[PDB]
Ligand binder design. Sequence first.
Ligand SMILES: N#Cc1ccc(COc2ccc3cc(S(=O)(=O)N[C@H]4CC[C@@H](C(=O)O)C[C@H]4C(=O)O)ccc3c2)c(F)c1
Ligand SMILES: [Cl-]
Length: 435
Amino acid sequence: ADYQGKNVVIIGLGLTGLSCVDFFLARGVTPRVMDTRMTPPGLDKLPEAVERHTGSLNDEWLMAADLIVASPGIALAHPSLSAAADAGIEIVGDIELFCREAQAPIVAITGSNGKSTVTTLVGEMAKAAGVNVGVGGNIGLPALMLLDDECELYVLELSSFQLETTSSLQAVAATILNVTEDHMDRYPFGLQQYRAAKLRIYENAKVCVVNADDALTMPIRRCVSFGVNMGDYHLNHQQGETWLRVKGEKVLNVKEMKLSGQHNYTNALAALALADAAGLPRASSLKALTTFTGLPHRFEVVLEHNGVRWINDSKATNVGSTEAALNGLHVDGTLHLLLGGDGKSADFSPLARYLNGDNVRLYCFGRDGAQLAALRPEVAEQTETMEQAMRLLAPRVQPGDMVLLSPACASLDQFKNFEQRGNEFARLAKELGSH
Ligand SMILES: N#Cc1ccc(COc2ccc3cc(S(=O)(=O)N[C@H]4CC[C@@H](C(=O)O)C[C@H]4C(=O)O)ccc3c2)c(F)c1
Ligand SMILES: [Cl-]
């Protein structure tokens, strides 16, 4: 693509918007930047030569543009963007800009749950093969920060929002891991509209990897599949042991993995299918499955002391992810479950089936705390903040108990990001969980 001479407007700053600014400047194009936030992150890092408009959108700038580069954090359906689209003004995002430039194959991963774990695992599979790999997207670096002539493979985590603005992805291997209700605040035509955004990832993919157990992951109209009891890649249970299999052949006894739990085993299958499709050697891919320890904030034991396990699952930002933490969970004593934040208009009802019995207490906070407490009011407490919830539950914790932050919500109503929520939980767990 050639941007020389174009009037380019970037909506959204932060590290990603900065990477877009830097991308254009390095190509001799000075873009303009706008952000609905008065003081967005990275503002002090924006060179003064770049004009900026903050605190609102500027329709004079948008309607004047030759190209609008929209952060995934702004809806295409925003009236100002729909007006520009109606006028024939091209709108793309950073992932589109990246795909037009990339000179190595791309493995592309989306889904409601599991996408960071699978992206990271395929990255580690590539590293173990000695491949020069760039891993990022919706995690790690913004994708444009990965671009490098020496890179031999890119592995991108892509969100539904990024996919809505991307048209030139031709992945060597692409997956939707699963589709469960999320982001309803951004999808007023509901689950199928969200699904449609993720289905874009398969367009012009060489290999599509689908979840045999989740029909919403399949194109509307020749994919490789993974699943539990069925799929090209599947699990084989042998007498209190589980194996990863490919078409009937055992490839790994999961006792060799550091990750545990069925959904992490299907994550491993999906990662293997993608790596296989990308041409990585099977042996080194399997080795990476044995070395990978997990991501921070993803069902992470932050303290195990005095008979109590404190688990930071701050990355559980939707109902499906909390369900994955709760389904089959073993707790000797009482589960003290922290829920709360911005639930993005989700129905939390599917969680209620895990919340019966005498051994569960809920501590509900943030914007949607009241809705969460309503799952089972008899065992629920509501506070404004997560710190208040922790200070309330800690005196009640007994040897054998579990304290689980798996909040089913985004963090942005009260936190910078889910990592800050997790770090704050870990600090408080260490304070409250020893004498
Ligand atoms: N104009 C403008 C403008 C343009 C961009 C931004 C910010 O850049 C983004 C880019 C993506 C965004 C995505 C969401 S989200 O509702 O999908 N929430 C997710 C990202 C934050 C995560 C966290 O809690 O750390 C949770 C996550 C999720 O999936 O819930 C929410 C806000 C997001 C903001 C912005 F704040 C303003
Ligand atoms: Cl029980």
